[PDB]
Every structure is written in structure tokens, then in C-alpha cells.
Amino acid sequence: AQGAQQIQLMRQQLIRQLRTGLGAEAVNKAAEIVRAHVADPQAQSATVDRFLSELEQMTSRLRAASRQSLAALVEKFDSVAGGLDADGLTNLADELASVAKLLLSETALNKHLAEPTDDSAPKVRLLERLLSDKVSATTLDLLRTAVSNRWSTESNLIDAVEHTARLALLKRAEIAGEVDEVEEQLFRFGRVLDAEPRLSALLSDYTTPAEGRVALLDKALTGRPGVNQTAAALLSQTVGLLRGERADEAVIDLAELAVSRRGEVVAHVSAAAELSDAQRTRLTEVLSRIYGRPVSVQLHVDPELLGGLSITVGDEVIDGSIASRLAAAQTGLP
Amino acid sequence: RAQASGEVAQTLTQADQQLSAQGDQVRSGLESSVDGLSAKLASRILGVDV
Amino acid sequence: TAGRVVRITGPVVDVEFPRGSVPELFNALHAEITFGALAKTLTLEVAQHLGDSLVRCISMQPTDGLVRGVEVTDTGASISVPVGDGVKGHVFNALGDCLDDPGYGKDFEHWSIHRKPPAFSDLEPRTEMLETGLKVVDLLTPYVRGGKIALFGGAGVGKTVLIQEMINRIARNFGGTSVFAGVGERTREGNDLWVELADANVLKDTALVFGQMDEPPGTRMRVALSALTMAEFFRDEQGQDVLLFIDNIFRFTQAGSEVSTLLGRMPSAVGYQPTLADEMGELQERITSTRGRSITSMQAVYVPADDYTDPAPATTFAHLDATTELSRAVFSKGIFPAVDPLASSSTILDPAIVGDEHYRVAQEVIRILQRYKDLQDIIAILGIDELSEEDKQLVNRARRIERFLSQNMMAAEQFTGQPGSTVPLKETIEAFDKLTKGEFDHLPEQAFFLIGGLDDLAKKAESL
Amino acid sequence: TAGRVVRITGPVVDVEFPRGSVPELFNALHAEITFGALAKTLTLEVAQHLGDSLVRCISMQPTDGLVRGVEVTDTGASISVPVGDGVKGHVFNALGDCLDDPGYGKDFEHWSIHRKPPAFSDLEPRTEMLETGLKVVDLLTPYVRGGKIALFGGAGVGKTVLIQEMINRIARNFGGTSVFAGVGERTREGNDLWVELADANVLKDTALVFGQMDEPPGTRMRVALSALTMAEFFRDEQGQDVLLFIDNIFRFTQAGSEVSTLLGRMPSAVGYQPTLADEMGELQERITSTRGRSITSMQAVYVPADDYTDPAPATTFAHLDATTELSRAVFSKGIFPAVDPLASSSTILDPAIVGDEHYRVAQEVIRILQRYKDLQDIIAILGIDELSEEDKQLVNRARRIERFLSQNMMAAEQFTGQPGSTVPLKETIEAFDKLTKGEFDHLPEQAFFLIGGLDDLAKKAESL
Amino acid sequence: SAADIEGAIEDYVSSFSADTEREEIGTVIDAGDGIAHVEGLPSVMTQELLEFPGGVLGVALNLDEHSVGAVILGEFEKIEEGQQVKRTGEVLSVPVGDAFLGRVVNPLGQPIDGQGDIAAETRRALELQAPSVVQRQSVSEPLQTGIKAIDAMTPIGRGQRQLIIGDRKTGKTAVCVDTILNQREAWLTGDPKQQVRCVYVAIGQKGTTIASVKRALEEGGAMEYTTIVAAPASDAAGFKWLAPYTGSAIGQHWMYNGKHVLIVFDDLSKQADAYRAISLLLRRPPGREAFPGDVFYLHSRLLERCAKLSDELGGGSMTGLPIIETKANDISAFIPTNVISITDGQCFLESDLFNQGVRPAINVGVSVSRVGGAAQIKAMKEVAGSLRLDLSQYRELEAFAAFASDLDAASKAQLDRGARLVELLKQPQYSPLAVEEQVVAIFLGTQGHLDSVPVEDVQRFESELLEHVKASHSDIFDGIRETKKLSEEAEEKLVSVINEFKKGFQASDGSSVV
Amino acid sequence: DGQCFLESDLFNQGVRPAINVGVSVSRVGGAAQIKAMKEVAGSLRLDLSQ
């Protein structure tokens, strides 16, 4: 009876392995057919349109103390920048970046300024006596607010001031009217950096003088005639205060902050080919509906997807890419 | 016991041979049906008629 | 004001609160697990303040299914257990939730399970004796009113029957109550105890608090304190003498060690928590007589590796005032309460506390029953006839002495039908003084089995 | 694309790679040391992905001379070793570099040292006895053909002498192929094995892979896997019967423990790595035979501190069909091969497999030896005369049996001077049947010492 | 035949659908030694199943504000930095149903025996709450293990947790396999209130050993009601950690459906090692013997699933037989102490007894079953009541076997009775005895009918007698199994048969027993 | 390759150099001895252990 079974189960195993082979061959043939079909631009655009139709039917790393301190500091920047003009914002940002560099260079100064205390009067007095005459008056209010609130750790203080130094430039772009252009630009610099790993690595001021890194950036990246002034200034500020964070991730995070200021969240989109502004419009509206907030779309075009779009925002992803569907079909086979 | 084991072994060998032959025989029609199966699978992973 | 779960590391959960609303230590916080299969309301007990508004908590319930960022609501008070006459006749878990009637007791008065023991000035300076009415306990191992009694034993030695006996006696002699703290209680044994008490009709006089083994270490560590809070309410508020059983206290110590390991504390001694003595004192020293009422306690203690020098027993025994050891030898010979008269010991059995006559009689009984044990080897190997006339007298007297230590226990009323016997201490002393002198050695051995006192012994003699 | 050495700490080297080219786990990377006498090409094996595009690797050769920032290239494949009939008759190291003929195998088929074990569907139990010619092994712990055998022992009790003897007994007349993995053993023993195999002309059918203890930890971890990969090629790609000798398989886990802390793992039990069981299983399950293709593995296991309760031997015990346990207690008496007759065990020793006369004789021998290990203390303190007549005669039988289980092994003529001997299984089982029945109780004890069989027993008895 | 083959692939093609839905993705930021740290997955829940790109699986076992430490359930070599981790959204769950009988499954329920897939009736999460105190019932139904020693002295009742504790190669797996085999006579009855379904969780065992256990069950016909949850040593620590819980879940499905289950674990010593490895790799603080703080919680949560449910919950039961391997017979080690505290009874199998010829080496006296006589049928209880006292007295007197000439008549009688009772409790491997035959054997022993047989022959006598009673006087066995008691009407007949047979027996020395 | 285990008990007993014959061993053995000493002392260590 045991032998009988063993032969019956051998027959069933033959059935299963023949089915596995048939499924593998069918998957290969279907993949070839779909890749050939999607090769035509009309078919690829049709797949993207269906993807869109289907979709239609659908500071965080800071600890509590640093979180609250940065929230209060940004509140301040709002009022302080509510009065300054473009030149005022530029001066504020430059002076904030300079004081951030000073803090980074002198480790002892950082510690004792960042060290929490019930009364901040000694820290405020230190900041006054060390920077009151050197920098503009409006910078003093922001720096006093920074050194007054208790930060979780010393390093956070730097992340505070640099953050403000960034916001100023963004506010400039907001008043000058290039807020979207500067963000788009940042994104373009992002991938640029992603395309040159050696350039990103050599830009680590944590290993070489910051001025040399900025000179390398100017000779390599910001020297292009068409670069917006705000984007170049933001990137120069970031690279000059990089402090070990990879320049790539730094600039992508800078673009994320640029879009966040405007209250929108950027969704990274990958596709076999760009898909017309028609696409952008419909896709942007659909994503905004799904996520209940205005959204920006960045196209990471790549032929690997072989069809529809793959979208990622925050920790969530919409994956209707044809490649993902091939993978699902292959895995789901017996 | 020994006869049961010997009979089981002989039938296992015969069944192995016969089932292997039957499987490669049926694999012939498998390769015919593969075309339609792959066409329909493509028309699924694409979401529209191929 | 509500916090968020930032870390889940096994039963340990870190909760981040706003700057000015961090819960104080040992507060009970509630978190929600909303996964369909494992839906629960976790009760976390704040163990530490890690700084920056983070509080490390030991989940009293399994954290399988908890999600980071889930809201945690602070109750503002330590784990609170229900207290009252209404908690008698029911079984609760360490958190004060009823198990045989869910939703029961949520309207009762609730008491924090963390409370300091009686003020030094309120402690009784004299160790009074708890006359239970059992011959063996009253004579050889007198229990200390408000003290802690080790209860060694096991299965098939009548430990549960003795627990029923003490529940009945504290309920019907002292007019008191019992609280059974099942620390590390096997669920099967918990249910068996529940049904056994229900059948004996003593559940109405007992409040059961089971911290089961399957529960995480936190509840096993806090169940003793919950039961002790119920006992403290019965003592201070209702003015009742309370008898608090703990089975097993070594499992309280083990739960403390596990919690200490989870929170990252370096183990001491043999791997036990550094705060072993402090925890054990906070548990035991609340078991004391104060203002006239007293929480007596019988604690089943497990000695690991049979090593009385192991820190767990070495710390438990600093608080225990008596020891009762049930044996399978004595049990097999038909002697209930099954107390081994010689292994068992009591620290109040000195003439300073007990009467001088009491000490003399007890020591004579111990001397006889020790000779008899020495002669048992001769009896079992070379026969009784190998002994001398004096030895054989001594053996015949010791047989009757050890059989007279048996008693028609109150808990047997459910089986044998005959009422239980409560012999006054004086009568026991006189009976054993007569029995050691040989004044009753002419009676048959059967006249002493399960007989409650001296007049009862006559009447089982004239009946024989 | 190439990486960059960021951190060097003994045999562990950290390499930072560009974001898009982090090597996969267990891939082989190449670095270069340029200093004079230590100049070489350093093979690294990725052990962990530390994040931030860093990997942490174990060095196969010593890292002495390696410099921070040196270029590291990824090979794109795990460390590969040559396979084929061409590996027979030659000596290899962990990386597959031939020693006796450098550059010999650089054109052979190369197989990854890392592969999954055979699927459970393919594993069938082995129950065919392997007659070795040794009395103790063939009687008490018979070995399994196609199964797994181990030679446990403490530091220096004769594991290497016995493993060489077993090579001489099984492999010398073996029709298939043999593979010897010198995993962290002494180099002199390896060279002696090489010369001995060359002299007997067995080398042509043997492949030797040496990772001797002069080499750093990583190569000691991977030499076992390399030799096992050659054995797997012979098992699967050629369907040939294979003998897989290993000495000493403990060195695999010892090297893992050596690099465990550097690689960032917290330590477990007595200084061992947490992944001890996982690594040992991943290596051992590969040594199993599958249906229709056999590997007779016989691997020496070193017992640290002569403590059989140590985690490494304890874990190894589960992966074994036959276990010959050497002990220093027996070795101190002179009873070569130092096998503890009792602790040593075998799965095939059942009445259904080895017979019903073999089983009875072996079990009676075990009974006699266990009784004489419980009487040894009494004999040492009280005296042999104080024993019963039956126990005295049993003690005589037991001493004679212990001395008869000793044997003058062929590969231990440098120990005893006299030549070796093979006792056929049937003759052993009759010899011991006679001994357990007192047929030889009159001969002196020394007649049974280091004597190979009944005829030699008679010769030595006549000599004395 | 060809109709079926493509039938299926075609069916896949069709039922297949283009799933497109929001999913939370993390990224592996660190991988090593079976642990992968995943940045992201904010909505991940503790002990959730995460799926990595290569079809790999892991369990989100640590959750910090930075990353999610997941233990990888095999195929760890395929994990890399930067790979996407996709959360399944469900805690660990295993398929369960009647289709797992006769199958060998890995802790995830996926078959590894090479046969067809398993028709899963339902899925049960590995962490469902154990039955409460109110949902249980007093253990009162025997679970005949077929071992005279266990069934007579340390009985197991359906719903009990009987630990089998012993050193290596002492008879633990043998005892459990004998227990599993002994349930075939109950299985063939077809009555769910008598059938016992078995689950054999193999942890850290070499593949060939699990195959040997499977062959032992199959030759004895026990595989048609037994399921093996095999986590061989090759599998990652995650499988060795989950295998007991996968066995408990498979058993629990039957338990809550009114069936009676027996769950064996060889060995919890290896599951604890796997959990220790996972915890230390995850950097959880270590305690005694480097074990994490919640190892006792691990084993208790596992074993408290075993229970007998009240009739309101169908009256099913699950009986655990955990196996733990002590080292140097140190029952005081951490894991042995934990399991001894958790379990309702212990069977201490010692190597010294095993070598002395006592098999299955159960050290009577130290081995206890807290359930006690409530787990025995009336006949076995009545016959074996004297057995424990007799064996204790024998162990006291064994030092006198040398100079028995000077012993009392009663003492020598006790010594001789014990010397034959100990032989009576011996038993060959894979030879379980039905409850009635055990009753008859202990009746031979305790009533003194063996006092005339030489000690050397008891084992044979007991056998040649039982067989005889099975062949020519099967009425006694029928009465015992049908009424559960050995009445006087049957006791007199049994004694008559014993005396009739004793005449026909030839002791090994040639003497005559009458 | 060996061990010459010197034991204090033997040293006090007057056995100097105090080599514990049993535990001590030399795995090179006779190969490290001239033929004469190999012949005279072939079994000396095992004889002394016994």
C-alpha cells in the first residue's frame, strides 16, 4: 500500500513538475509578447493611461526636545522673515550659515551652547558677546531662539541653524516667484549628484575643507548658465555644512524640504518613458485625491519598468508597473 | 516482507519508467497549449486584449 | 497629553509623551492593539524614565501585534486592583480583571497595588501565636499570627486539602478571609483549585488572584502585590484577619529577575535581579499584624537545585517565621494533615513565646518521633522483634503519637461527612503530655487515626 | 566600482563600496597588501552589511600589512573551489590553491563553497553497518555506511591517531573516493597523513584540503565547507561512494567564536557565538547522504576543557549517527583507543540491524561496565573484599572487558611498537560473549591488554 | 492526463488578476547572521510577516524609532542593503486542517515531504491566547503512552504537559514515538472521543533523524494520524523558534474542534537556543546562560496552549510531551528548571539506568505526574497502587541484596518483589502495550504471580503470558478495555490462566515455575 | 604534539621529574627515539599507566 502510494505520489509529482515547466514556458512567452507589444509608443501610452484610470478608482528624525525646539524656531522664522525683503533674506541666510560654520568648527562652543538648562541667560549672553556685532541684528533673534530652547543632543543645534539658513532661501524663492523652479532645479541637481558618485563623495566637507568643496561644486555643477541662483545658493550652503551626510541624500532631502515648505509632498514616479503633460496633469490630480494634499511628480524614467508607472511617496507605493506584474505572474505560478 | 518489498521495488521501477514516458508524451501537447496560455497571460498582465 | 509607542522590544515598550505630561513610575498606561486576531488593550507599567519624555514600560500583556505610533493613554495611577467584600468568591488576574465574570468589579473601590508597609510605630512588638486548631501545627510548628509560613509539598500530599483546611479555619474560627495569590499558577492547577474550592463551598470565603504562567513576567511579578492589596483592604478597612496564600513565591522572584533582565539591569548573584532583597521585603513586610488585625500568609516556596543558600530561598527565608513540610510518607500512612512533624519547623516554638509546658511537650514528641525514625530502619530490615523491650515500647508509643497528630480536618467535611475538629491548644498540650508518658499506649493504634482531640479519642476507644 | 578598506580589526575588515555596488553576502572580495615579505592578495568574505554602503568581511589570510583605503574588488561570486576527478591525489587549502603543485586546479570546474543542504525529500536513513576491525567500535558503537560518525575527545586523547587509523581501515580498501578536511588541526599530523597515504598508494583516490591552525579564523571556518563542496561534487555529479574525513570540526565553531565579537554579535553561553547551532547545522546537513549516493563522514569533534557539556559538542551530538567518545579517564589508564564504552553510542546498534547476538553481547558489556563504574568508588575506599561474591566476579569480568576493548591499532605502532591487528566482527562478538560469561575469568588481566583477538589473547596468556 | 496539466496553468492564467494597491515599503539598511534591519514600514506591527524581494520571509520582531529588526526565516543569503521590504499586514499565521495528517511541514506550514500541497481548511495565528481557567476542565481521561513505567507510575492524562527530560541518547524520542504509535488502536476505532491526533515537532534535528522518525511511525502505521513539523538544523533560527508554535497551532485547530491532540517537541532545549541566538543578534539584554528575559514566557506560552477544554468548547484536548536534553543530568539548568516548573509532570530518563538495562530508563521516584490517578483507568489505578511503594522499598533495600541471608522474611520478600517489578517495567523499543495488557502485566507483578519466576525470565514470562492471553483467553482483555476495571469475575479467571500457563513455562535455567 | 603533565602530588611523593605517566603522551613516540630506546621502552608508558 505504501508502494502503491509512492507510485501514485510519483505520478502526482510528475504532474506538478510538468505543470511547473509549462508555467515557466508560458510566463516566458507572455513576457516576450508583452515586451514586444509595449515597444510601440502608442501601446506604452495606453498602458500608462489605464494605470492612471485604475489609480483614479483608489525633521521626523528629531527626538521630542529637538522636535519642539525646531518647531518653535521655525515659528520664529515665520515672523522674522515676514518683514525682510529678498536682500534681507539673503543676508539672513548667509549669516546663519556662517554662524553654523562657526559652531561646527568649534566643538566646545557647540556643546556649551546646546547643553540644556532651565535658564538660558548664560547661553544668550555668550551668543551676544561672541556674535552681536559681527552679524546682522535679525540673525541674533533666530540664534537666541535656537540657543534658548533645549535640544535633545548637541548636533541637533547645528541641524537647527542650518535648517533656518535653508528656509530663508526658500522664502526668497517664495517672494521672487520661483518656488516651483527652484524645487524642480534641486531635483535636477539631485540626480546629477546621483549620476556622479565620485562627485558626491568628494563633496564631503567632513573630510576636506568646505571652501574647496564649494569650489569643486562651482566648477562642476553650479557653473552651468541656466542654473537658478536660489538653487545654486541652497546647494552651496548644504555642501558647505554637509557634516557627513551623503551629498546625494542631502540634496534630495533639500528638495523634499523645498516642496514641504509649500505644503505639498513629492511622489517619485518611474516609467518606461515620459508621458506628456497630459499625463502629469491627470496623474497629479489623481495622487492629490488619494493623498488629500497637493503633490509633485518627479519622473525617474527607466526602461526596466517596461510599461506603466511605479509611484512612491512617503513610505507608500503604487506598483502597477508591467515588470511588477510579470514578477507577480511568475511567482504566483504553481 | 521480502516479497512485499521486492514487489514494491519492481512496481516502483516499472511505474517510474512508464510515468516518465507518459510525461514527455504529454509535454508535447503541453508545448501546443503553451502558446495560448502565454497569449492569455500576456493579455492579463497587460490588462487588455493582446 | 497621550503618548506614542516609539519602541517595541518584546514585552518592553517605550512611550514618548509630551514634555510636561510624562507619567510617574509604576503608572498603568493603556495601549490598543487593533489587529483583528489579536485585538487587545495592553496595560503597560512604567518601569523607567529614559529621558527626553521617553518612559520604558513592561507590558503586562503580550505585545504581539502592537504598532509603532499607537496612542497610549495614562491612567494616572498605578495598577489598581478591586477591593471589597465583593471580590470574595471570584477569580481575578494581576490587573484586577475578573476571569469568571468579565466586567465584574469595575465599579468596586480600586486600590493601588503599590503601598508602603505599616508605619514602624504601628507594628506589633510581640509575636502572638495563631491558634489554628490543628494538633500538629499548634503543637510542633505553631504558626505566627501575622507571619509567613513556608509550605513545602507537592502533588498527592494534600497541599490543596490543607489550603482548604486553613481557609475554613480562618473563616470559621477567626471570622476572617483568605486571598489566594496564584503567582506563576499553572492554568490547569488554577482551574482545578477554583473547582475544588467551589465544591468545598469555601470559594465564598476566598478571593483568588491568578497570575498565570502564560502571561508575561510583569503580571507574574505584580499578582502577589495585587492579592496583597486585597488582603490589606480586608485587614485595614474591614478589620478582618486575612490568610494570604502565595504559590509560588520563587516564581515571584523569578518574574522579578526576568523583568530586571528585560530592562537591561545587570544580574547579580546567580543571575537574580540586583533589587532582589528590596522587592522581597516590599512584598513580605506588608504581610504583618497591625492595629489588631493581621494578614497571615502561607507561601509555597521552591528551593532551586535543592540549595537553601540560593539567593531566592536565602532571601525568602529571612522573612518566613515557620515551615510546614508535607511528605508522602506521612501521607501514605493515613495521617492528614500530612505534616512531617520533624522536617517542619517553627521559629516561635521557644519557651519565651510559647508556654514552657508547651515547649517541653513538643520537644518530647520530637524526641520520640525522631527515635522512631531511627528505629524504622531496624524495623523495615530486621523486623520489630530485633528491637529491645524499651525500644519496642518507644516504637509503639511513637506510632500512636504520630497517628494522633492526624486530625479530622475541616476540609474533610465534604468527603467523610463528619464535622471537623478544632482542639484548643491547651487540650492538645495535655493530650500529648499524656500520650508521650504512655498513659494511652494500651489503646489500639486505630483509635488515634483522624481523631479530633482527647474526648473524641476516648469515644473512638470505647467504640473499639 | 571597487570598494575601499575603511576599518581593519584583526581578521575582520570593513569595506565601503559605492551605493550601487555593495557586494552580496558571502561574496569574495580581493584586496592587496604590498609590503615586502607579507605582500599578497588578500581574500575577504563578506559577513555582514553594516549599512551606509559598508560591508564587514572575514579575511582568509592574515591582515598583517593591510592598509586603510586600499582598493577592494568584488569578485561577484562566493569563494569557489575546484571540483572534479582532478582534485584527487592533490593537496588544497581553503581557497582552492593547490599546495603540492601551485596553479594545478585553476582550470578545473569551480563550485561555490556555499550551497544549501539536500532537500528533506532526498534524505533517507542509513542502516548498513561498516565493519572497521576495532573491537570497541565494531561491538559497542557500530558505524553506519553512508551515515555520520564522530570521534569526540578532549584535548589530546587520541582523536588524530584514531582518525588516521580509521582512514587506514575504511579508506585503504575503499572502492570510491575519499576527502580529508584538516579543519584547524596540527600541520604535522596532516603531513604525516599525506606521506602515509602516498606510501600506501591511497593518495590517488583521496583529496586533501588543509586549513591548519596556523591560518586565521576565516579560512578555518571555510576549509570545512571547501572540502565538503568537493565531497558534494563527488556525491552528486558522479554518483560515487565518498568518505569525508574531517579533523577537527570543532575548529569551525571556534573560528566563528573568534570572529563573532569583532563582527558585532553579543556573546552566548560560554563565549560562543549566538549562531553556533545555525552555522553547525548549515555545515552538517550538507554532509548528509541522499538516497542512491552516499557520504560516509567521520568527523573528529574536539571537546573544550574536556567538558562534554560544553555547547559545541552538545550541539554536534545531534548531527551524528555514530559517536565514539574518547575520554581522558580511560586514556590515563592506558586503554587505547581511549573510547569510553558507555558514553559512546550508535544509532545502528539495534537488534533489527546488527543482530540479536551482537546486541545482547554489547548490552551485557555495557551493563557490566556500568556496574563496575558504580562499584569503583566502593572498591577505592572500602575494598574489593567487602563486595558481594557476584559483584567481585563481575568486577573481574569488567576489568578484563575494559582491557580487551583496547586494541593495538595499525596506525599506532609508534605508540606501542608492536604491529596492528584487525578483529572480525563475528570474532569480537564471540570474544565478548565468552568474556561476559566468565569463560576467560581465569586468565590474568594483562593477557587482555592491547591484544587483537582470541588467538592473540591465547598467545599473550601463554607468554605471561 | 494532459487535460489536467494545462487545466491548471490555464486556470492560473485566468484567475490571475492585476493587483494594484497601496503598500508600505521599507528598505534593508543592515543585514547579518539572520537578522535584517528595515528602515521604514511605519505601520508594521510586532511579530508581523515581512516579505523580501527574493520570496524571502522575516518576522518584525524588534521595532525601534530607527529601524525594524526582523529575523529572516531562511534564505538569508539573498538579503542585501537597499532591498525593498514589503509588509504582509498579518501576524505569523500557519494553515491548519485535517489535511496535515500524514504530512511533513516546515514551521510555516509549507510541505517539505515532496508530496502535493496541503488543503488548508483555515489559518491560525501562532499567538492566539491559550484557553482561560474558565474554559478548561479537570484532566480525567487517560492518554495511554504504551510504556508500562509511564502509564503505571507517571500517568499522562489528556490535557497534561508531561515533560520528558534526560541526557542525550537516553530514550526520549523513543518514548515519544512509542506514545505516538500506541494511539493507532484508538485511531482505528473511528470515534473522535477516543482518537488521538499527533503532531511531532522536530527542532534542530538532522534531516535523516526526522526521516528515521517518519519511517518508525510509518512502519507502525502511525503516520495516517501524525503530523511532523520539521525544523531541521539547517533552517534558520527563526524556524527552530516557530516550530513549536506551528505544531501548537495545528494541534489547537483540532483541539477547539473537539478532537484530542498529542503534541511532541524534540527538543525545547533547541528552540530556546534558537530564541537565544535571535535575541542576542537583535541585541536584547541577556540573562542567565545568555538567554533573554522572556525564555520562560516563551516556553510557558507554548505549553499553556495544551489543555482540556470545557464541554462548552467542544471538549477537545491537547496533550504536550516536551522533550528537553539535560547536560550531565543537571536538571537545575535554566531551561530544564523553567520547563519543570511549567509542566504538570516529569519523566526523568537517566543514562545510568539506561546502561543498567532499565529501558526506557525512567527514573521512578524522582519522576512524577501531578495529575496522578485521575489520568489512569480504574484497573490500572487499582493494580499499580502498590507499585510505587514496592519500588521505593526495593530501592531502599537494594544495598542488602548482597547479604540477604540476614534479612527479615518480609524484607527479603520486598527485595525479591522489587527485583521482578523493575524487570516488569522494562520494554523493548517500538513495542507499546495496550492498556489492558499493561494492566495484566502490573497485575502479574503486584499480586506476586511473578515471585516464583526467576528474575532473568520475567520479561519473557510476561510476554509469553500476554500473547497466550491474547490468543486463547482474549475475554480478559475485552473486559478490561470495555469496562475499564478488572472485576473479580475476570480476576479469578486471569489468575486461573496465569497458573495454567506457569506449568507450561520453562525458565531459562531449566527450573519449573508452579 | 604531546604533553608532559607534571603533577605536584607525584613531585612530593618523590617521583621527580613528576611526569604523570597516564596523562602524559608524545604523539611522535618511537619515531623520536633511537631504535635501541624504542625497543627497550616501547610499551613503558602504557605499562606504567596500567
Ligand SMILES: Nc1ncnc2c1ncn2[C@@H]1O[C@H](COP(=O)(O)OP(=O)(O)OP(=O)(O)O)[C@@H](O)[C@H]1O
Ligand atoms: N526502550 C528501549 N529499549 C531499547 N533500546 C532503546 C529503548 N529506547 C531507546 N532505545 C535506544 O536508545 C538509543 C537512543 O534512543 P533515542 O532515539 O530515543 O534517543 P534520545 O534519548 O531521544 O536522544 P537524542 O535524540 O538526543 O539522540 C537508540 O539506540 C534507541 O534505539
Ligand SMILES: [Mg+2]
Ligand atoms: Mg531525540
